[PDB]
Amino acid sequence: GVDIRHNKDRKVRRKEPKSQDIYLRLLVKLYRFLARRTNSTFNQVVLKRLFMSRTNRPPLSLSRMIRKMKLPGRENKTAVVVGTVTDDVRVQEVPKLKVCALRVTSRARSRILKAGGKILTFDQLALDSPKGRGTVLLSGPRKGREVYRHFGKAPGTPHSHTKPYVRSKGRKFERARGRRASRGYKN
Amino acid sequence: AKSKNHTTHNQSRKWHRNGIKKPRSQRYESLKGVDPKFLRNMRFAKKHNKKGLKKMQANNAKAMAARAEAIKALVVSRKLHRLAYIAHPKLGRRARARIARGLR
C-alpha cells in the first residue's frame, strides 16, 4: 500500500485539437515536428494554442493589433495570432503590417493589403521564421465574451457587481426587494 | 422519530481535502475602508504629481551623474585538485596533452 492520492494525477489539458478539420490537423502535424525538434519555445506556444477551443482563441480586432504594434521595440516584427483577425471600423488609418493568422475576415484582408501589408498563413510562417524569430505573438481579449459578466460571486451578495440572468430587462424585472433600500434591503 | 442533533465529526476531514488555503496574498491591496478625509487628500496628492515633473527629471539627471563621477573617480589536498584540473573538459585540454606523448 502507498500513501498517496490519485485524485489529480491525470492532468487535464488538450493534447490534440478536438476539431476534425484536416487543414488544422495538417498544421498540427507541422508544429508537432517543429516544437519537438527545435529548442525554440515559441513553437511550443503556437502548438499549444492550435489545440485550444474556439472560445479560448478569441478574435483579435484590427485596431488591437495596430495598437500593440505601435510600441517602440517593434515596427518590423511579424504579428502572429492563432485566432482570427477581424476588421475594426472605428480605426481610420492602417500602417503596413506583416500578419500571420489562422483566419482573416474579408474586409480585413482588403484593408490590410490595401495598405501595402502582407498576410501570411502558418505554413508560410514556418518557412520564413521556423524558430519564430522576429515575431510578436498576440492574443485576443480572452475574457471579452459576454459570459464572464455572469461569472464570479453571485448577485445579491455585497459588492458583487455580477450581471444576473434575466429573461428581459425593464422596470419590473429584478429591480425590487433585493435591490432597493426602500424594499427590504440591498447589496 | 428523533434524530441526531448536531455534529462536526467528518468536517475536519472534509475541510482538508482541498486544503485550508490562506487568502490570496497580493501586493497593492485595495483602499476600501480607509478614512475618507485621508483618502480624499491622498487623491489630491496624485492629482498634482505631474506639477513637479520638471523638477523630478532635473534632479534625477544630476543624481545619476553624481554617482557617475563617483565610481569613475574610483575606476583539500593539492593532489586531488591537480587531477580535477586535468579532468576538466574545457580548461584541461592543454593539460591532458602530455598524455598524448606519454604512451609515445
Partner: protein
C-alpha cells in the same frame, strides 16, 4: 426546484396545449397551391398586369 444559477423561466404550457398544436407539414404543398392559383389567375386576365391595380 431551481438549481444553482439560472433564469426564472415561465413556460406557458399549463393549458392543454398538446391538443392544439398546429404543424406545418402542408407548408410546401401550400406554397405549390398558392403559386398554381397565382399563375391560373395571371392567365385568366392575361394582358392585364399580374400584380393587380
Amino acid at each position: 426546484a431551481p438549481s444553482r444559477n439560472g433564469m426564472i423561466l415561465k413556460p406557458h404550457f399549463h393549458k392543454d396545449w398538446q391538443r392544439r398544436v398546429a404543424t406545418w407539414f402542408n407548408q410546401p404543398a401550400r406554397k405549390i397551391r398558392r403559386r398554381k392559383a397565382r399563375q391560373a389567375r395571371a392567365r385568366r386576365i392575361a394582358p392585364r398586369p399580374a400584380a393587380g391595380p
